[PDB]
Design an enzyme around this catalytic site. Structure first.
Site, PDB file in Angstrom:
ATOM      1  N   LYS A 197       0.869  -1.206   0.000  1.00 50.52           N
ATOM      2  CA  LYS A 197       0.000   0.000   0.000  1.00 50.52           C
ATOM      3  C   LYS A 197       0.910   1.263   0.000  1.00 50.52           C
ATOM      4  O   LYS A 197       1.292   1.836   1.040  1.00 50.52           O
ATOM      5  CB  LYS A 197      -0.888  -0.019   1.211  1.00 50.52           C
ATOM      6  CG  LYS A 197      -2.053  -1.156   1.141  1.00 50.52           C
ATOM      7  CD  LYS A 197      -2.663  -1.254   2.528  1.00 50.52           C
ATOM      8  CE  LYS A 197      -3.594  -2.533   2.744  1.00 50.52           C
ATOM      9  NZ  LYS A 197      -4.739  -2.341   1.867  1.00 50.52           N
ATOM     10  N   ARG A 223     -10.015 -12.010   1.135  1.00 55.67           N
ATOM     11  CA  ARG A 223     -10.802 -13.092   0.460  1.00 55.67           C
ATOM     12  C   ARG A 223     -10.142 -14.475   0.399  1.00 55.67           C
ATOM     13  O   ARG A 223     -10.827 -15.495   0.407  1.00 55.67           O
ATOM     14  CB  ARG A 223     -11.283 -12.659  -0.934  1.00 55.67           C
ATOM     15  CG  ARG A 223     -10.155 -12.746  -2.078  1.00 55.67           C
ATOM     16  CD  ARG A 223     -10.716 -11.973  -3.283  1.00 55.67           C
ATOM     17  NE  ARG A 223     -10.635 -10.526  -3.077  1.00 55.67           N
ATOM     18  CZ  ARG A 223     -10.923  -9.611  -4.006  1.00 55.67           C
ATOM     19  NH1 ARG A 223     -11.327  -9.965  -5.279  1.00 55.67           N
ATOM     20  NH2 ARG A 223     -10.821  -8.336  -3.647  1.00 55.67           N
TER      21      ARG A 223
END
Ligand SMILES: [Zn+2]
Ligand SMILES: [Zn+2]
Ligand SMILES: [Zn+2]
Lengths: 514, 518, 514
Positions: free
Chosen positions: A297, A374
């Site tokens: 990030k 996920r």
């Protein structure tokens, strides 16, 4: 409980948790407004509105059992002030016994039915009256209509907003009584201790979220879950790496390869003493820090500094176990699950492109190491389904796109079963934690077709990520009613620079209503 | 002490040249009133024309040689002017019929030369020495300079002439020879003679700083740097102590230790001490930032303009301090006790690194919320400042490549100074003037302090709203000095010479002058 | 008056300006604190501290001439409250005659020396109470120490912050009386009407700034200046395009080439009735909208929606004309100058790379059309030096780098003359508008050596842009003491979402004390 590894001896080895909070010492008394209001020590606040007259005058309608106070609050004196939502005023006067008393009001506007957001505004105003005033008692007089659920919400919010987290303060007085006057007081009395339980569940989740990732890592978070289970007499099992390998949980294991903290899978169980009529699995995403991995990030607006909050789903689920363990619902068995790990950059990390095998045998092509939530959820869903439950509900800070769709106020719910989705919406209504139903659009599924593996982790064409991630997760539930709550947008309160503990009350209303 | 390696080809020390060719130069200062003998090598006149911008060259010295005097007549020189930095070379035969080189460098039309002016003069002179083989240079001052500026002339000539070839292998410069003799003719020569050996000590402190900064991060790491500091102390007879991780855990230096958690090199804290014989009147701690490589950590230096390839230089503060320890240990001032401190570590990305959001505890008990892992310098300096204050010192001065925002406020020429005490600040500006290393006083604006308020910790490491990050870093540092006069010199903009692609060794002379002035 | 061009008939043709504000109706009285306090009418607020005791209890010492309020102010009540800077409480009560009053305090923290910034926080907290108050009088009791200038700053800030700008709009009433209790009241009295004058100078500058670029354009701005000059009886001249062409002001005229609004150069003059001993030119940057031109403000952080504020310097110089024309100093002649235009994108705009000629004959190579402020100031400075003044001071929202060097609190001053810089710093101290001296580093001058023109407009290598811009301006002043105040970082109050009117009081103090 396992030993927390340390790089230096100054690294902390547990999350500090406050269980006995000052809110727990507050004695709460509820009186019926028909007997009139007594006005003595502390601060007495009236909640007043004026339906239809936007910023209309204050009128105090309840009987007050003091002639001096009644004279102060007569319509002629009060009409110079108005009901604008959130507005407030302090009054000082001597009563019939020649003692000084503090009285006031908070404006509740000119709409008869207050929304959840309106009420929060009223509560915030009320809490600024408690801050910077050493008071032994607060008394609140409801001159506004609220149902039972909104009354409870009033209490929960009050308690949560008043309570201040000072665990990490080093170099840097709460009331003891709360009186409430309301019409039909005997019917509202039951909400008071429910509200106190709900407050602590939410505040407990908030403590876990706010604890930074050096304090709150996969080992210390699972130890906190153990200690919770021991205080509540829940059953518990923490699955470590050897056990996870045996279960072939390669999607979850890959995400945690680059961490110095071993993966720990949390499995807590509540079982009712009577015949069980419903089995539920609650699954929370548990990433104790999300660097993004090799997809670091680093982009503007990625907010890597907020990433300790990426276990907010696991926190909501443990806050729910607190409320369930305390209230003891009958006829139900609830499993609280979280695949806990940390997503880091290392010589040992999984890479963009790697192909990994989930515990149901499906191969997954990793397209972005920052879509790790996920993957860990996919193995937790397979595990949840093997438990043989009636419903599986997961909750997760899954996609940043949530900020662009619903924003910071409502969470999104997706699922494979409409009856379950309705129950979650119903629970949203009665918990006053807002959620909105979003579609799983089957047309996007083809974009998860991998040239090499059974499935791609991410879409390379479709920008609707929260929908894409729900499609991916759906592939790991074969035969069970399932819903997925994406709380990425609602979990952190940006204005107040703290967690909301969002989802604890929603999930607990779900379990209890069932 | 032992430097860890990943492979056997990884270096285990910083190479350091101590006896440099500058040390072999014999220097003689002669009074100009006696006239110049011109007998060999290169003779350079420093010449100006006060008033007349780009005016003609006119030699004012007597030259004790008929031939050279004939060549230097005004008619002959008039084709040439004195524009700052301009130069010319002449070739002739003297009276002894030996070939001789003669020249001049122009020093402009303003009789008072700034530090930057004198630097241009030296640079042109050094171009005359490069790509030439010479045994002797003589310099004739036909300009007016004070003692400090004459010393600056020599320090700068020495530093710029010296070429650092430690990491050359197949490309060592074959045609690089250094002069063996330097003659200087000047007015009132006896008064400048004292500056020669002081210039030589200042050159070396400064070159030594430069060697450590220029050494890449795989040569200069926290273990090899602290080892070089021990060697330096041993050569100077300074007392010294290197604190290792177990000692730093006992001292509870949590902010400093969190920064180096992700490095393969253990943290090493350097503490050297110089103490005068006799009466100690002033105790000073000099604290240098010593990050041997700054990747940014998890807030990786990936943005355009972040210059991650420059970040070996993030120990430039610690180099300045060590170069100061060299000059102090050599010159032996009276009535002082000086502590030379650096919390040395490396800021890396690892499974072991600290993260954005982490709450760490400093050695004074303050809890700090990390908002960005690339604000690591002020975390190390916070623990070093607590340590310095516990020494019972009268002044604490820190020097540090702290904030890139210095490029936007002062740029590449002047360093900024911040502090909590106006007398100390003024002593620094004074030493800036006598060292000729330019510094500008910048404010610590207390109105910004509220942006360091943390919701959970005692304080934030960084502001999320104020962009004046050199000021915010100083407010942060000020929280770690309770009751001692303190100043902070931000050298992020001045430390590297981008034009010449090498370190300046900035700070060594500023700090020495400060110490010697006291 | 020139006619304002319009594209559609709904385009505005003037700037609305309020001259008579509610602040001008406030009667102010100052009493000595040693005499004790009359609290029988209206809202009374005590400014209180607790030196050495961080967040210490409030204690009020003043004797008061009301028994009810006196009871309220006793130590046992006030110690419930604390002095943390900006914290406040206030209570409605009935006085000895059964008339409604309100009483409270604002905390002044625990350091006796208040800074200007500290004092702003005190005032904001007081203003918050006022924005909910309808009692006709305010009394402020100074139980803290402040000097004369700081007391005047208190008033200026109170008036400025209390006043709200409602010109563009389609709970409270303004007070009619303000009483102050302060030690040595007699010496403080002369500061009142000076404060009221400085307040309006600053508010008027603010109204110009806040006016959007469709209201406030080169023609409407210079019309407003003419109306100001008429009301104050100042000499005035507005120079139009034909006169600017005759004067050869090629740099200024190029910047305005792409706008639909003709360039207008404002020149007002105040001249003292006596002998004139000092002549001063005040030059303000007056770009009424800066789009950046072909170097458009499109990068993140370039803040194009703020660029109506790029006439802040002009507004400061005009606020200062109001104060000077009102206060009427002796012995001085002051020229108030602004080269007004708008920097737009059009087939007619100047281009990056254009070579343009200034009115002193210097040719300029344009490296970036968004560094237009220094082009307009180059011609204004030449114009100013031809007036034959002793001092030139320019003020301008010139470089965004100011936010990285001094931030949003302190402006930077640069100059060619130490004594003039010293007078500016002294005026900063007495006006309480902070400025810090930054250097003009001559080593950077070579970076402005153009290959083709006399000089470059910008550096392609040096990142210290505020210094480089000052080096550039310095080339347009040949033999006059000059200083440049860069107010890019300090002009807009980003937290309050409004201008500061920064520079009016600093400029006036400079002219009044010289
Ligand atoms: Zn995540
Ligand atoms: Zn650094
Ligand atoms: Zn501009």
């Amino acid at each position: 409980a396992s030993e927390v590894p340390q790089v230096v001896s100054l690294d902390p080895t547990s999350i500090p948790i406050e269980y006995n909070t000052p809110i727990h010492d507050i004695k709460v008394q509820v009186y019926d407004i028909k007997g009139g209001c007594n006005v003595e020590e502390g601060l007495t606040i009236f909640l007043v509105n004026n339906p239809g007259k936007e910023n209309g005058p204050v009128k105090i309608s309840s009987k007050v059992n003091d002639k001096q106070v009644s004279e102060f609050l007569k319509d002629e004196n009060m009409e110079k002030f108005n009901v604008k939502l959130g507005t407030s005023k302090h009054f000082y006067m001597f009563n019939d016994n020649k003692n000084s008393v503090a009285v006031g009001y908070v404006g509740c506007g000119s709409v008869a039915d207050l929304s959840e957001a309106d009420m929060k505004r009223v509560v915030l105003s009320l809490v600024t009256m408690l801050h910077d005033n050493k008071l032994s008692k607060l008394t609140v007089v409801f001159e506004i209509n609220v149902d039972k659920n909104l009354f409870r919400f009033f209490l929960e919010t009050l308690f949560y907003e008043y309570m201040t987290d000072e665990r990490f303060k080093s170099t840097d007085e709460y009331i003891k009584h709360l009186g409430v006057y309301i019409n039909n007081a005997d019917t509202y009395k039951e909400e008071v201790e429910k509200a106190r339980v709900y407050y602590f569940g939410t505040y407990y989740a908030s403590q876990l979220i706010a604890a930074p990732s050096n304090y709150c890592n996969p080992v210390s978070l699972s130890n906190a879950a153990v200690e919770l289970a021991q205080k509540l007499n829940l059953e518990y099992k923490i699955l470590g790496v050897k056990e996870l390998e045996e279960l072939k949980m390669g999607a979850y294991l890959s995400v945690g390869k680059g961490s110095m903290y071993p993966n720990k899978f949390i499995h807590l169980t509540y079982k009712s003493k009577g015949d069980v009529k419903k089995k539920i699995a609650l699954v929370g995403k548990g990433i104790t820090f999300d660097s993004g991995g090799y997809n670091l990030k680093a982009a503007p607006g990625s907010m890597i500094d907020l990433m300790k909050f990426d276990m907010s789903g696991c926190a909501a689920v443990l806050g729910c176990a607190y409320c369930v363990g305390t209230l003891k619902p009958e006829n139900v068995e609830i499993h609280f699950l979280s695949a806990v790990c940390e997503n880091m950059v290392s010589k040992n990390s999984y890479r963009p492109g790697d192909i990994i095998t989930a515990s149901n045998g499906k191969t997954i092509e990793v397209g972005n190491t920052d879509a790790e939530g996920r993957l860990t959820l996919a193995d937790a869903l397979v595990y949840a389904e093997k438990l043989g439950v009636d419903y599986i509900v997961d909750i997760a800070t899954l996609t940043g796109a949530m900020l662009y769709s619903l924003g910071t106020s409502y969470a999104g719910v997706f699922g494979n079963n409409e009856e379950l989705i309705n129950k979650i919406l119903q629970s949203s209504k009665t918990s006053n934690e807002p959620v909105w139903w979003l579609p799983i659009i089957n047309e996007y599924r083809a974009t998860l077709n991998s040239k090499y593996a059974d499935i791609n982790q991410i879409s390379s064409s479709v920008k609707a990520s929260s929908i894409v991630a729900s499609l991916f997760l759906k592939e790991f539930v074969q035969n069970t009613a399932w819903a997925h709550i994406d709380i990425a947008g609602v979990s952190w309160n940006f204005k107040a620079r703290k967690p909301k503990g969002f989802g604890v009350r929603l999930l607990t209303e779900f379990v209890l209503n069932d």
